[PDB]
C-alpha cells in the first residue's frame with residue numbers, strides 16, 4: 001500500500017477540487033485519476049459506515065459507486081498526515097464538457113440532447129443513492145470520447161440528500177438558484193433542476209446565461225444562438241423563478257424536446273467521430 005500500487009503521470013488539473021494526476025494501477029495497467037486534497041482546505045467532513053473521519057466527498061462517492069458508468073467511481077482512497085488521496089476511474093481518451101464547448105462552440109441540438117439526457121440519468125442515480133452533487137456544470141462532466149458516455153465528477157461541494165431546507169452552499173455561484181442568492185435557502189431537487197437549466201442553455205448557446213446576481217434574480221433568458229422553441233421552453237421551465245414551478249426529473253425527461261435520444265455509441269460515431 002501507499003505509492004507502490006500506482007505510477008504517477010502528468011498533472012491533469014488543479015483548483016477547488018484539489019490536484020488531480022493521471023495514473024496507472026500497476027497491478028493491471030488500469031487507467032486512474034489520483035486526486036490529492038489538503039486536510040486544511042476541507043470544510044465538510046463525514047463518517048463512513050465503518051466509523052472513520054473522512055471528507056464528505058469520500059462518503060458521497062462510496063454511496064454512488066456501482067456498475068452504472070454515469071458517475072465516476074472511487075476505487076480506493078488513502079490518508080496521509082496532511083491530505084487524503086482518492087483513486088478514481090479515468091476514461092481514455094477524455095475531455096471535460098467545458099473544454100469541449102470551448103473548442104467546438106454551441107452544440108447541435110441532437111448532441112446536446114444526448115449529453116443532457118445522460119447528465120439527467122447520472123443526477124437521478126445520485127439522488128436515488130441519497131446524494132446531492134450541488135455543483136453540476138460543464139467543468140464537472142467528463143466525456144468518454146470513444147464511447148460517447150458522460151461521467152459526473154467532483155462531489156466535493158455535495159451533501160447527503162434531504163427533504164428539508166439547505167442553508168449552506170459552496171458550489172458555483174453562476175449555477176446557483178435565485179432563492180440561494182436572495183434568501184440563502186434552497187431545497188435539493190429544485191436547485192439541481194435550476195443548475196440543469198443553466199447547463200442546458202450552456203450546451204446550446206456555448207455559454208452560461210447569467211454572470212451577475214441581478215441577472216439570476218431577474219431570471220430573464222435571452223437566446224444568442226438559434227435554438228428550437230421546444231428547447232427554449234424546457235430551459236425556461238428549468239429556470240423558473242419559483243422553485244415549485246420547475247419541472248421534476250420525470251417532467252424534464254418526458255418533455256417533447258427530450259424524445260428520441262441517441263444512444264451514447266451512436267452519439268460518438270456521429271458527433272465525436274469514433
Ligand SMILES: Cn1c(=O)c(O)c(O)c2ccccc21
Pocket residue numbers: 012013017020033035072088089090091094142153154
Ligand atoms: C476523476 N477525475 C476528477 O475527479 C477530476 O477532478 C478531474 O479533473 C479529472 C480529469 C480527468 C479524468 C478524471 C478526473
